[model samples]
Target: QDPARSVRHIAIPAHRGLITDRNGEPLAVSTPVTTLWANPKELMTAKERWPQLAAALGQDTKLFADRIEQNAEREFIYLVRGLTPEQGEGVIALKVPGVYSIEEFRRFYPAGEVVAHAVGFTDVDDRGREGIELAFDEWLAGVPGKRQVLKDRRGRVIKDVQVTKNAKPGKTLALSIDLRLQYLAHRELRNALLENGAKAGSLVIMDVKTGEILAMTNQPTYNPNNRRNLQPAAMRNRAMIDVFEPGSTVKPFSMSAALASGRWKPSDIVDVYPGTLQIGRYTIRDVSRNSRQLDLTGILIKSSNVGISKIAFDIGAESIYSVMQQVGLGQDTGLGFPGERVGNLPNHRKWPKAETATLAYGYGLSVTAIQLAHAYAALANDGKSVPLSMTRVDRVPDGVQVISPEVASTVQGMLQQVVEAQGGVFRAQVPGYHAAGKSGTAAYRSLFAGFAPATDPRIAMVVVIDEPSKAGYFGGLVSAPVFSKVMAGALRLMNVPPDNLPTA
Candidate 1:
């Protein structure tokens, strides 16, 4: 039986798996530290080794010695503070009495401040406090184990028995992130968050071909190392967590859903020349000039809300919402992550006439950026949507038939015209690469601006600056350039070659 049986239960414990970057590099890890402990009562019994032991451990010789004496009579005294392995070894070489050290795992973050919102730091007991660490705590925390031992006259273990439970090591957790892409996205988003001079912003870039998440960045971010100053909003990954109306950025899917239902041809024209269309008490308008008799591509390129609304009216709410449901809005993404939002879609039975037009151009409804991106990827990939995967996907996800490959190709051509024909398609143009998307300036708590969401042969990217600077506004003005830079960097990081230049 051990005399200090209760003290033994207080064995140091550690937890959590090593957090790695998207490329499997350690982001947050553990390093061994030596914790020096002393039972002053035990130390007091060792009169001879006192002064010598105190000197080697940098005890103020007198302070630790004095404190050791007073504390030994009451409780255990830990005279030696934490020490590096070298220092611990050197001190032990001196054979100090009543001083013992144990190897403890201390949390280490290599990327430091940049990764705070993703790989959260841990508390003293090795428990994850917040962020990915907190959310994936069980996976990161290494279970602590113990062994039974019998001590002799000296504190030496004379006999030992195997621990009932052995300490299990933490597993290596791989993120869907690409380190280069993450770093690039972080730098650009940080700059965007700062340069835009607005409240905050976030963007997510995912592979269209494989559905792997290339990068995710949230502005108003905090340093992972010292998160003490973090506000409630700073630590969030707004990319998937926050919901917005998505503005005209939502228009492409409304068009796609209509086209996919064998409902409308790309050549079908709508007279958005009236600029504004109304149903009951509500009205929808396009920013373009009134004489614009636009085709589906022209409506998308011009961001014609009326054109999209008219098409939505033609398709009816049931067909449109059916497509929305198939594409994953108002549904959980099953990401194995925490706090993911399932955006809303009105039931088919609840459809109002105005609801069709209103929700058609991204109003009166809310959805996550992930859903939009996922849906668009389906459009890009021949009208079959795969589940968005962070890691490399070995098996293709079971997806629903949203549209025929021919229809998917046609929609792509129309979307491509948005970037190719409209020289100002900021988010749609990929510089040296070919890409296409739509921009939106949705109404806000204050004013209005469209939003930007786009797709490429390889990736789907969205930049939602819901409330951009008052000094400046418009999704094309605020978000497209960011889309260009981020997408360019992601292409380079992923080494995707440009298929064609945007046609002038």
Candidate 2:
């Protein structure tokens, strides 16, 4: 018996798991491929046969010959990777001395850039590199197995000796994302970014009751399938990693704090006479100062800087900070997403009146797009704060009571009034549903955060546009329209009943 034809141990590669949306639509999948390698020393002995191997690989004969010569000292070298089954078969049929192939898996993403930021991509070795792929690598990567086989002198497997181990395929991963809604959000966001000429943008949609992320997308994304020259900026998951000052979107929560403190009522009047307030060197001004005496709800509807500032000063800094904390600000979303950020929330032993006032109208603090949506979902869920999820949730988790039901209901009604009344964020309205939300503009950033069907809220959404260089820069102008379009489609897709339909 020849020693070269003896039984040998071989390793079998395990296939990676499938990543799908909540509706069973495939997002990321692995398919079988072939990797061709060569034992440089053995191949160098047959230099005369090099031209045939190079021709089969469709390479320059001289270049192929030189590569083998340079790496001749190395025992093993990869010649080609990710070759199709047919291509590998054609190459192996030549049976050239030291040329061999092995079965492997290649990761492919079907949704491309549309789902790139969430599903992420893998490396040439089939290792997870980013986003959910990096976060749940262990769960999605299975164990490889070993087997024994008898080979001929030419290195071809002639017979099966024995099976030592079995390959275990990875488990399927079901994400909380809804593919239909994701497409809607991606299209609307991209259109808005183009029209506004914004530098970048992010959008998020969540099930208010379940805290499941139905749709999340970002602009300037890269295709996971072909990442030849991917930019680092385009690879960022902006909705989860980027943070900004929330501007006027936090006014309702400010009122929530005031209401929870029992120091202010929805109908309580405030004197914002000059439409501006002077605290230290800073002067807080409102866009419109027409109303000298406005109620608390009016303060939110108008987004009056002076009114909320006075309220913030009266109730003290701790009250507002507590409310923001309860609503999941300045904390991780608990999803354990890679590179997820917790926006800044200041806590000072001695508060500056200026900081407190700024905090009231959504300055002096920061929040990610997902965090903003999570906080709004709490209001939409009637003061019960549920943990946000990236993967599918089979059992609904218990929610913590963050605010009194009465305060949450009152704030929700006030937000609805903001949409119904003039000079409010009426642009965020959905045709057949009652919409409630606030628009926020802070320098170069424009944002809209809200929920629909106010009477029986179902979904919460947030849109942020960064540095809109063309058209208008206000959140009501740049981001609200996107929210309206995406929310309209999502509500219909989820079959949520309309509460504000027209009556003949």
Q: Give per-model TM-scores.
A: 0.82, 0.93
lDDT of 1 by residue, 1-504 (tens): 536433132354554477787667888887776777765556677777877777777877787567776676543445555477888887777665556666777778887656655666777666777656776778777687776555444354344545656778777777676777778777876676566666777677776656766666677777766656678888767767787676677676787778876778888888886788777887776777645688778787777888888888888877777777777776777675577777787675767877888778777777777776777777777677777775546566666767677777777777667766844375446677766766676434111111112333677776665555554433545677677788777777777766664653
User: Global CA lDDT of candidate 2, please?
Assistant: 0.87
How close is each model in CA RMSD to the real structure? 4.7, 2.9
* Model 2 agreement with the true structure over 1-504: per-residue lDDT tens digits: 446776777677789899999999999899889888887877988899889888878889999999999998765678888888888898898788778777988998998888888888887778888888888887887888888877665445567898799888877999999999999999999988898989899999999889899999999898998888999899999999998889899988889999998788888999998999888788999988887998987898888989999999999988989888889877789988767899898888888998899889988898899999999999999998999998898899989989888999999999998877777777788888889988888547888999988878999999999898888544456888888899999999999988875663
**What C-alpha lDDT, on a 0 to 100 scale, does residue 209 get in candidate 1?**
58
Best by TM-score: 2
- For model 1 the local lDDT of residue 189 reads 67
Model 2 regions more than 4 Å off: 1-11, 146-165, 472-476, 501-504
- Each prediction's Cα lDDT score? 0.68, 0.87
